Amino acid sequence: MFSQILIIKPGTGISPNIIISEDIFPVLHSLFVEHDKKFGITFPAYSFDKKGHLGNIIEVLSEDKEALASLCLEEHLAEVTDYVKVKKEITFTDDYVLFKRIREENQYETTARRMRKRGHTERPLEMHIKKKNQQIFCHAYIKVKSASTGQSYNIFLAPTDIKHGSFSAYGLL
RNA sequence: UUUAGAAGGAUUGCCGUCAGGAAAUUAGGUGCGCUUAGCAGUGUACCGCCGGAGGCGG
Questions:
Q1: Cβ of residue A132 near strand B, that is under 7 Å?
Q2: Cβ pair A19, A11 in contact under 8 A
């Protein structure tokens, strides 16, 4: 489907990850919440070696050649331009590896509270947190702040093989 | 197709008593260490929700 490719300009001091997290996410999520129809996000350079990176490059994907123009890409990112360039041609294509959202247990105290009142009252838990968190953590992230809960959380990512489907507000499957 | 082919070494035991190492000394003059440099995988993994382990929202 149609797509608009996003560079971060390289060799500027700041890392890709920081620039991607702070700039691109907030404005894309605000635009995504606004224009309700679920768009999609793909990273053309995922390269999991022992841990997993995210690359210089991201792709916004959608299935309407005018919906991308309804997002007004190159005029929204008009402050931080020195670190981001937004190409302006919504070219269709049929090659991509879509991504999803992996989750990660939660700290022992926050599980406990639910773990007691919910019932199922009173070391087996700690093994579950340690194993489940240790397995996942070695993937990529995109630190996220909050508008409501006003909290800091990290949204991990991982590939999949669906090649079509229905997406979410942040951008994954 | 090998100087081929073969093989049970084994039982037992009290090393002991005594003793002065000791007197003398000069290690000494010299000395060029010295050019360069960006520390981090995002600096962390937060509240809840289903639900008898496995999931999903922000």
A1: yes
A2: no
As a whole number of Å, the end-to-end CA separation of chain A is 16
Nucleotide nearest A17, from its CA to each C1': B42
Q: Which of residues 19-38 of A touch strand B (CB under 7 A)?
A: 21
Q: Which nucleotide is nearest to A153 (CA to C1')?
A: B46
- Enter the tokens of residue A72: 């007004």
Resolution, given in Å to one decimal, reads: 2.6
| Rounded to 5°, angle at Cα A19 from A106 and A142 | 20
- Amino acid making up residue A85: K
Obtained via which technique? cryo-EM
Count other Cβ atoms within 10 Å, centred on residue A124: 5
Which 3 state secondary structure label does DSSP give A76?
A: helix
The CA–C1' separation of A167 and B23, in angstroms, is 104
Find which nucleotide's C1' atom is closest to A18's CA: B42
**Structure-token pair, residue A143:** 């630190």
What DSSP string runs through A123-139?
A: -HHHHHHHHHHHHHTTS
Provide, in whole angstroms, the distance separating residue A65's CA from nucleotide B20's C1'.
Answer: 115
Report the alpha-carbon distance of residue A134 to residue A169 in Å, rounded: 27
Instruction: Yes or no: say if A50 and A169 are a contact pair by the CB < 8 Å rule.
Output: no
